[PDB]
């Protein structure tokens, strides 16, 4: 049956063009249809909330990807906007052809889309992350649009203090797309976390924020550092004997501290909740400003009985060391604390987030694992063994045993061959030869009915870099037969980037050039129609490359000194004219490990521009409507609908 397919992202962003896709299906060879697509309000009477763009599809020119701009004045004109958050808007495609030819109920067909006023990217940073009352705090705000280019729109910036009182408001033009300001933290201020927020003036919902902590002036005579021998303690009953630590203390000007250091041991839990041994404490005279401490198993057992073995076991806890050191000459005591000493099942840990939860009978299934060591880095080079048990009805339950070494970003992608008749896949993964980092998963089979399956085949399992070309194989699977073309489209961030049509071959291959429009991750969605039922599948491709679109490299060159100080040259190298914002920070504040207030890095901005990703899960599922809304699309053909998203966050 001839029909019109309407595609669009799940949510609408005000001030951001919505890329809507139209596709004409099953029409006679000489047929030509023209129409118009626009947004309209269902909350009031159906007034258009946007301009209307026209389209024309032939049977041999059957698809078009259209940019629908949604401005503020028309959203205000259709009575939609302001304080109330998360309304729903209709995107309708209009043509006489639905009534004139198909004899449907009305001309229009459409889908309900969630409406958000958030737009653009706003980054903001302070000249220091921690302050004392009386200090001057300088901050700057960067403004960019959806396509990650500097924006000239005006912004509204506000500061709120420890108790949430709006204390400074400033609204500025942005001719340079960067804003700089300064203020002085009052000398009588209470200690606590202040917050700076900034949003586009007409955005309302587009706010981003950074925060800093002001607290009392503390500058000690000497710094104290606690360093465990292993930053983790294995909780395996066969090996609990690691715990040992080094103590170190030295002046700001370098002189080692001679005194007596007292370390007291305990246990820490979720969200703090201190508890410690009242009968165990170890003291040592410092030598070379250092000391080396160990904890015996018998002392640990005696302390565990003193605490009556707590709740159950130590797996969820972390070893807690509080250090008090008092210098012998001065007689002044200084304090330190170590709060990162977790009891671990294994130093390595498995993550199976990128593994799809849906099988395709007769097509391979990719187990994709991430192994990260402690809390510091992804583990590169560690073997990962996979045991996959196929459950097939009334037949042999075959098992597949295969291992692979992590490389690059610490990832392993292992193909598992799925037979044409399956009930489920029982999966168990083991990482690391000496210690057992384990994970398990069970993937259920799709129903025996349905219109068929589509396999989007990934031959090169390695994560692409920006500049690589990824090859994807499309093959209809199993029951399906007698169809013409494959239809596919690319989704990156919040919009459809590209949409195309592929004629079938014995092996149908599609090549995607991974440029900077697809960073940091994109979805490949493909589908074909079996009569009046769509068959669809998808996969998410995480681009594993932190490289900039441009480039900024810092390098300190030759130096020279006449002894009032020392001079050195700093080189700023980049590609194309750019505004380079600089800043120099003392490493001492981050060396201790206090707070997660890292400065802006390339991983965070990639995470920030990926906040507009509407997809949920790593790949589509059993039904085509599930596949499309898992990818992040709204879809309607006049016969099947996709329900509007009730929350911007994933379920």
């Amino acid at each position: 049956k001839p029909r019109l397919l309407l595609f669009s992202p799940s949510v609408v962003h005000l001030g951001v063009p919505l890329s809507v896709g139209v596709q004409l299906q099953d029409v006679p060879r000489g047929q030509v249809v023209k129409g118009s697509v626009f947004l309209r309000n269902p909350s009031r009477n159906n007034v258009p909330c946007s301009p209307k763009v026209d389209f024309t599809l032939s049977s041999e020119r059957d698809f078009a990807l259209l940019s629908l701009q949604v401005p503020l004045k028309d959203a205000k004109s259709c009575g939609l906007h302001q304080l109330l958050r998360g309304p729903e808007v209709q995107l309708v495609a209009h043509s006489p052809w639905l009534k004139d030819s198909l004899s449907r109920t009305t001309n229009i067909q459409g889908i309900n889309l969630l409406f958000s006023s958030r737009r653009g990217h706003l980054f903001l940073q302070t000249d220091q992350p921690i302050y004392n009352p009386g200090q001057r705090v300088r901050y700057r705000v960067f403004a960019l649009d959806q396509k990650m280019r500097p924006s000239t729109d005006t912004i509204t910036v506000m500061v709120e203090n420890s108790h949430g009182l709006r204390v400074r408001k400033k609204e500025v033009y942005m001719p340079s797309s960067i804003f700089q300001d300064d203020f002085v933290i009052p000398d009588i201020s209470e200690p606590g976390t202040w917050k700076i927020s900034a949003r586009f003036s007409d955005g309302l919902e587009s706010n981003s924020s950074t925060q800093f902590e002001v607290k009392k002036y503390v500058l000690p005579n000497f710094e104290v550092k606690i360093t465990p021998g292993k930053p983790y303690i294995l909780t395996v009953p066969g090996h609990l004997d690691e715990m040992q630590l080094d103590i170190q203390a030295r002046y700001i000007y370098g002189k080692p501290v001679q005194g007596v250091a007292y370390v007291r041991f305990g246990l820490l839990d979720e969200d703090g909740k201190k508890t410690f041994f009242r009968g165990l404490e170890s003291q040592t005279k410092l030598v070379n400003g250092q000391s080396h401490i160990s904890l015996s198993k018998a002392e640990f057992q005696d302390a565990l009985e003193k605490l009556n073995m707590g709740i159950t076991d130590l797996q969820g806890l972390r070893l807690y060391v509080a250090a008090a050191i008092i210098e012998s000459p001065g007689g002044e005591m200084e304090e330190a604390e170590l709060t990162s000493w977790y009891f671990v099942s294994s130093p390595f840990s498995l993550d199976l987030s990128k593994t799809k939860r849906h099988l395709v009978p007769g097509a391979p299934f990719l187990l994709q694992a991430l192994v990260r060591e402690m809390s510091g880095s992804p583990a590169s080079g560690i073997p990962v063994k996979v045991s996959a048990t196929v459950s097939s009805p009334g037949s042999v339950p075959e098992v597949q045993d295969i291992q692979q070494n992590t490389d690059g970003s610490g990832q392993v992608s292992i193909p598992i061959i799925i037979p044409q008749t399956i009930s489920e896949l029982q999966l168990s993964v083991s990482a690391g030869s000496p210690h057992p980092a384990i994970a398990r998963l069970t993937v259920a089979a799709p129903p025996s009915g349905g219109p068929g399956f589509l396999s989007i085949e990934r031959p090169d399992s390695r994560p692409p870099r920006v500049g690589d070309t990824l090859n994807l194989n499309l093959r209809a699977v199993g029951s399906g037969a007698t169809f013409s073309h494959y239809y596919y489209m690319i989704l990156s961030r919040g919009q459809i980037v590209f949409m195309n049509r592929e004629p079938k071959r014995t092996l149908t291959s599609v090549s995607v050039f991974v440029d900077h429009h697809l960073a940091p991750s994109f979805y490949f969605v493909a589908f074909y129609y079996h009569g009046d039922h769509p068959v669809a599948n998808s996969l998410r491709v995480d681009v594993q490359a932190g490289a900039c679109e441009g480039k900024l490299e810092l390098s300190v060159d030759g130096a020279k000194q006449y002894r009032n100080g020392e001079s050195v040259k700093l080189h700023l190298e980049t590609d194309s004219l750019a505004l380079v914002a600089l800043g120099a920070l003392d490493t001492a504040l981050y060396a201790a490990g206090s707070k997660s207030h890292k400065p802006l890095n390339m991983g965070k901005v990639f995470e920030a521009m990926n906040s507009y990703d509407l997809g949920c899960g790593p790949g589509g599922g059993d039904s085509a409507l599930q596949v499309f809304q898992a990818a992040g699309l709204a879809f309607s053909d006049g016969d099947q609908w996709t329900l509007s998203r009730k929350r911007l966050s994933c379920p």
Binding site: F142, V184, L554, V568, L570, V580, G583, T587
Partner: protein, 697 residues
């Protein structure tokens, strides 16, 4: 609970020697005193011979090169680093119109110099005190270093051998040693001490440290300032002679300067770029510290009072364009400074986490309501503030304050009636300004309640004003409050004529203050013997506050006329030398009063003043001829200095009235006997070990 903090405070040491019984007398809270006392008693005798957060280091040097650079293909920056204590992380991010944003990977930079010199100076030294400098030599190498160290010569300091003497110091490997240089300052100035270290033959290594040492004159500083009335329309005041200083406690060594400043443009001097809208504001002009909550209003209300004058008289053009930026910068600073004091229910406390004050809550409501003129759009928080203020109104119609910020009346017996009326009239003024915050169509119950609260309070003020036992201060606020809120005319009239019946007048001046009965035995019924050749006697802060309220009341009651002219003339000649008045409260109210008068009495015509000053000082005979006018902003720019001990002779002409004031500042050897009458203070230093031995028994 708070009992944990009270027990922790009980075991914490105190600098003073305090046993637990007298120490627990200060807490004044029963559910805190019981754990505080028991934990103190535990620590007092039974104990012989952290719990929450940890003390992570919080002071870090400011972010140098916090800047943006326009970078093309590449750019080269030269950095200068004195010997770095810690490693720097140099960060950077790029924003380009063509290729988007890029965050650069950081580069580490440290200067770990082999030989490092560390000089430390005292904050300030008085001349002919002796000090032994101990610059510390740091050797970070794995070997010994023998360096030749010397302190550079400089005049005014007694260096050893004039500064050419050098000492050979062996600094061991990986350690530090000081080298002692004794020096005696003989002249009071800011001198630059430069310590130089150079390796003698062994290694060509060196370092140098230069720091400025402040040498001050002996004794303690003393300050006296006096105001002279310049009027050529009166032929008696066309010439006057200013006598020199002859204080018997003055320090002998060193000549001192008497500073004078003359003006014929008092409003621009007071509220212009040289005065209230200086980049430091009136806060910089006042001598007082400004830590407390009330003092923060000196950033806003004088700045607002200056803005209203310049806005409504239309002469922002006569001030530099930096002035408008100064005003909004001061208002933002003051608004941020006070909002830390706001409590959850909308009240304001004198100090952080202290009890609420009805007076301060009213004061903040009054000023921040005026602040909506150019920093508006915040009605909710001011509506909360006034709604809390309504809850402090008693059945009498008056308001109660459990912890008042400002006590001022000295009329015994009636002091409680004065303070209750003064507080009530002050809250009424604040509530009246609160009406202008919300011109909203809705939220009228608050508008109706504050209108009803003002009417009940005005009836209370009317009874006490008609009874006529009030002091001068209470009647001053009451007369303004009744005129401001447009109280019944019968109440308005009795308060006005009761206020005027307490006025004191002399020459061209009208003022209020301390008029319980007949205050002098030689005066005529209304004037007094004072002529322009005599100085204007400086009045206490109470008199300036009362006269400012009376002047504000006169502007609402009549507008211009002689009574406002004579009252404002006295106020403009009570201001301190460098701007502002006695303290914060009298300054803010007087600047509001003078601003309202200056807007009403402004004229576009130009009147001038010619002043010729002359004196014979240490620099000989000097004379200055200045012609001034009403349109000429002036101030600190043209201070004129003469020798303190020599008299100044001035002659004045023109067609306008002006003001001359003189500043005498000098150090003293004794504190005379005109102080330590009402209040007392004694300060002693006992030595650390001697006090430790007295405490440890």
């Amino acid at each position: 609970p708070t009992a944990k903090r009270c027990c922790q405070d009980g075991v914490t040491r105190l600098p003073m020697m305090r046993s637990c019984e007298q120490r627990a007398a200060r807490v004044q809270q029963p559910d805190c005193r019981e754990p505080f006392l028991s934990c103190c008693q535990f620590a007092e005798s039974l104990r012989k011979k952290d719990e929450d957060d940890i003390p992570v280091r919080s002071f870090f040097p400011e972010n140098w090169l916090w800047r943006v650079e326009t970078v093309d293909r590449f750019q080269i920056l030269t950095l200068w680093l004195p010997d770095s204590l810690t490693t720097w992380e140099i960060h950077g991010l790029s924003l380009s119109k063509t290729k988007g944003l890029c965050v650069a990977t950081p580069v580490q930079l440290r200067v770990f110099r082999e030989f490092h010199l560390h000089l430390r100076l005292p904050m300030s030294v008085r001349r002919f005190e002796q000090l032994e400098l101990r610059p510390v030599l740091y050797n970070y190498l794995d070997k010994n270093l023998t360096v030749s160290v010397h302190v550079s010569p400089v005049e005014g300091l007694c260096l050893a051998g004039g500064g050419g003497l050098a000492q050979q110091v062996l600094v061991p490997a990986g350690s530090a040693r000081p080298v002692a240089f004794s020096v005696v300052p003989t002249a009071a100035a800011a001198v630059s001490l430069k310590v130089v270290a150079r390796g003698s033959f062994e290694f060509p290594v060196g370092d140098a440290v230069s720091k400025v040492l402040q040498i001050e004159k002996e004794g303690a500083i003393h300050r006296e300032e006096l105001v002279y009335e310049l009027n050529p329309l009166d032929h008696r005041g066309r010439t006057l002679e200013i006598p020199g200083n002859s204080d018997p406690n003055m320090i002998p060594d060193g000549d001192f300067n008497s500073y004078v400043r003359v003006t014929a443009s008092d409003p621009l001097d007071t509220l212009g770029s040289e005065g209230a809208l200086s980049p430091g504001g009136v806060a910089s002009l006042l001598r007082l510290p400004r830590g407390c909550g009330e003092q923060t209003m000196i950033y806003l209300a004088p700045t607002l009072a200056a803005s209203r004058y310049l806005d409504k008289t239309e002469q922002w053009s006569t001030l530099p364009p930096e002035t408008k930026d100064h005003a909004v910068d001061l208002i933002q600073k003051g608004y941020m400074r006070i909002q830390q004091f706001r409590k959850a229910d909308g009240s304001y406390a004198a100090w952080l986490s202290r009890d609420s004050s009805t007076w301060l809550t009213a004061f903040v409501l009054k000023v921040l309501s005026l602040a909506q003129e150019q920093v508006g759009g915040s009605p909710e928080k001011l509506q909360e503030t006034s709604n809390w203020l309504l809850s402090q109104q008693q059945a009498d119609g008056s308001f109660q304050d459990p912890c008042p910020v400002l006590d001022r009346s000295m009329q015994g017996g009636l002091v409680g009636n004065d303070e209750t009326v003064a507080l009530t009239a002050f809250v009424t003024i604040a509530l009246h300004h609160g009406l202008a915050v919300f011109q909203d169509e809705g939220a009228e119950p608050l508008k109706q309640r504050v209108e009803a609260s003002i009417s009940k309070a005005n009836s209370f003020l009317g009874e006490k004003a008609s009874a006529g036992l009030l002091g001068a201060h209470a009647a001053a606020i009451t007369a303004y409050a009744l005129s401001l809120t447009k109280a019944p005319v019968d109440l308005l009239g009795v308060a006005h004529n009761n206020l005027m019946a307490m006025a004191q007048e002399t020459g061209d001046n009208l003022y209020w203050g301390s008029v319980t009965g007949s205050q002098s035995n030689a005066v005529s019924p209304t004037p007094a013997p004072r002529n322009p050749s005599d100085p204007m006697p400086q009045a206490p802060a109470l008199w300036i506050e009362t006269t400012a309220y009376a002047l504000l009341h006169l502007l609402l009651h009549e507008g211009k006329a002689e009574m406002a002219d004579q009252a404002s003339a006295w106020l403009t000649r009570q201001g301190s030398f460098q701007g502002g008045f006695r303290s914060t409260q009298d300054t803010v109210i007087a600047l509001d009063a003078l601003s309202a008068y200056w807007i009403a009495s402004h004229t576009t015509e130009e009147r001038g003043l010619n002043v010729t000053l002359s004196s014979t000082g240490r620099n000989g005979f000097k004379s200055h001829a200045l012609q001034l006018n009403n349109r000429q902003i002036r101030g600190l720019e043209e201070e004129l200095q003469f020798s303190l001990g020599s008299k100044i002779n001035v002659k004045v002409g023109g067609n306008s009235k002006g003001t001359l004031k003189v500043l005498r500042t000098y150090n003293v050897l004794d504190m005379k006997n005109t102080t330590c009458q009402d209040l007392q203070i004694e300060v002693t230093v006992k030595g650390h070990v001697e006090y430790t031995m007295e405490a440890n028994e």
